[PDB]
Amino acid sequence: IVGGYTCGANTVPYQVSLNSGYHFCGGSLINSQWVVSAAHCYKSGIQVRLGEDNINVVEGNEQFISASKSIVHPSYNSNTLNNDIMLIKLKSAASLNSRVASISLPTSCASAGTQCLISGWGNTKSSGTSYPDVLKCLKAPILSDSSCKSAYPGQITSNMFCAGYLEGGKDSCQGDSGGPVVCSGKLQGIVSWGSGCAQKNKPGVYTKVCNYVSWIKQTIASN
Ligand SMILES: [Ca+2]
């Protein structure tokens, strides 16, 4: 997260870190046994870390649970990042408490101009490189589809939306991939892609979760 703020320990209780010997992507806990992330975050050998603030210090509220199965969306296209969404099933259920909690799926899609909360342990510089140890947060608005399409002509599908600031300075970044965009208490986006981070006229591009709720519910009901 570039241009954000320190969240506060366990104030984003649905945020997970995906770990394959190191933190590599975020995700969101949607019930006691399932996490949503980005398909471009796929790797073998995932451990899900819940209740994290400082990813480099064991502080006492963490739960570390290995993935039993990963399921990348059937229509994921790694070239275009269309359908950039994956489910991860935990080997055992998480214990839900004030520090570890699930986020609701949307029933309706979110509106342009809504201010959303984006969070992660990704790079904090626009260029140059500096990764935080504690969770960072950013408030950012949903942009109109026409502004999104103007910023990335020929690249935006109906399964993407843009959020952030056309002047630059505030954005998600590498390492935040797979993490949540929460608007009005619902998971509306997944950190997916962008040209750089926090560059002028190059806002963040997010997977549109509300187009996937049927697939998520059917997959969880069968696995
Ligand atoms: Ca920790």
Swiss-Prot record:
| Disulphide bridges, residue numbers | C7-C137, C25-C41, C109-C210, C116-C183, C148-C162, C173-C197
Q: Which SUPFAM superfamilies match?
A: Trypsin-like serine proteases (SSF50494)
Query: Which coarse location class describes where this protein primarily resides?
Result: secreted
Q: Where does substrate bind?
A: D171, S172, Q174, G175, S177
Catalysed transformations (reactions): Preferential cleavage: Arg-|-Xaa, Lys-|-Xaa
Active site annotated at which positions?
Answer: H40 (charge relay system), D84 (charge relay system), S177 (charge relay system)
> EC number(s) in its UniProt entry?
3.4.21.4
| Similarity comment text for this entry | Belongs to the peptidase S1 family.
Assembly: Interacts with SERPINA1.
Identify this protein by name. Serine protease 1
The species this protein was found in: Bos taurus (Bovine)
